[PDB]
Design a protein around this ligand. Structure first.
Ligand SMILES: Nc1ncnc2c1ncn2[C@@H]1O[C@H](COP(=O)(O)OP(=O)(O)CP(=O)(O)O)[C@@H](O)[C@H]1O
Ligand SMILES: Nc1ncnc2c1ncn2[C@@H]1O[C@H](COP(=O)(O)OP(=O)(O)CP(=O)(O)O)[C@@H](O)[C@H]1O
Lengths: 204, 204
């Protein structure tokens, strides 16, 4: 029972949009996924209300839940946790039971200076728990992506080769009540799949 | 001493990017602005470290500050407050001393379902304190903007005629250490100015 947690307090990063599409992909590979929504506004949970999501959704009300992900969601292969926006007993909650931690970040000057808090929480664990960086909403602004890329290594943690581009299908898809794998955009699906491939590799 | 507060817990909305460019505009009209940074990571405060911002920056450490905006920043015409990401004693803090409240929102399916919490806090005030909605990062996805527009009125509060478009100059400009009024993009500046005109009108 491996646990993947997408953490990063700075909102408008990509956690939920990432969690949906990525787990959706993991489901399409035979894995019995179980996404846990912790956001106080159950954003992902609402989106799941529309149509039957490829994965099973669980709404955790308090830290007392994020901690049982091990004993409760034991029947599932993966247990993806959609972090909230506030570093309370939730960010440290995930890291404590998770087996892998993804930090979604945007190519912004200060939208990344909020991830560092997470990287520090991981330290407290080392048993050590795996962790990588996820470049989301990647816009093609050369000069800054480099700024992001650089400041990412100074954290010690590495980031997946692939980065989710800031495409339209990601916003529209969620609006409807489904992922991008429910569209005709091969590009969007592409990266998601190659990224999901990397995620599974991490467990080798 | 009129106070304008940009509130909205859901991050990645536009508060800081809005506060910079808008106050920057207010400064370019003779107004003695004073922006208050409350974000725990002082994002706007950092950006201000680069070059001399058109306005004066103040870093408030705790709720004990947001409350003195009246007695402290009395010499200034306007006192713009850049809200944080967590609805604690900060969101209710602003509304309690502010004279006008701007709620930045993005054309996302659930990135707006976080503003409502704010609208409820205003109720508690009614003396009543003015409030409007700000459409930021406006992307041209017809179908959803309408979804946003509609769900905005059901809140009772109206939104400025003008909406900040999701332009590149806004991200790059901040990266450098200045607003858009420090570029050659007439479009970006445009809306900001017309929006700033509306903001001042609210005080008639
Ligand atoms: N890959 C992508 N391409 C384009 N837009 C994206 C995107 N990922 C996220 N967005 C947009 O960014 C905004 C916030 O994204 P998202 O909901 O993923 O953030 P979070 O802040 O991760 C959510 P939550 O707090 O519920 O976990 C929305 O307006 C969404 O449409
Ligand atoms: N008008 C606009 N056009 C294009 N990108 C914008 C934008 N307004 C904001 N952004 C982008 O959105 C992200 C978050 O914006 P911003 O920092 O304004 O959010 P906040 O969440 O308002 C910040 P803070 O929490 O510090 O108050 C950044 O990656 C930024 O470049």
């Amino acid at each position: 029972m491996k646990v993947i947690s997408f953490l990063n307090p700075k909102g408008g990063s990509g956690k939920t949009t990432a969690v949906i599409n990525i787990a959706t992909a993991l489901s399409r590979s035979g894995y019995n996924i179980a996404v846990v929504d912790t956001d106080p506004q159950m954003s992902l949970t609402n989106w799941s209300k529309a149509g039957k999501a490829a994965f099973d959704v669980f709404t955790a009300a308090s830290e007392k839940d994020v901690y049982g992900i091990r004993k409760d969601l034991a029947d599932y292969d993966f247990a993806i946790v959609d972090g909230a926006g506030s570093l309370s007993v939730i960010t440290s909650a995930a890291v404590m039971v998770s087996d892998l931690v993804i930090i979604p970040v945007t190519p912004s000057p200060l939208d990344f200076s909020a991830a560092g808090s997470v990287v520090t929480v991981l330290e407290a664990q080392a048993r050590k728990v795996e962790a990588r960086f996820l470049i989301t909403r990647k816009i093609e602004m050369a000069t800054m992506l480099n700024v992001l890329k650089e400041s990412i290594k100074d954290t010690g943690v590495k980031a997946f080769r692939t980065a989710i581009t800031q495409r339209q299908v990601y916003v529209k898809s969620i609006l409807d009540g489904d992922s991008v794998f429910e569209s005709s955009d091969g590009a969007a699906k592409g990266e998601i799949e190659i990224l999901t491939k990397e995620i599974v590799r991490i467990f080798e």
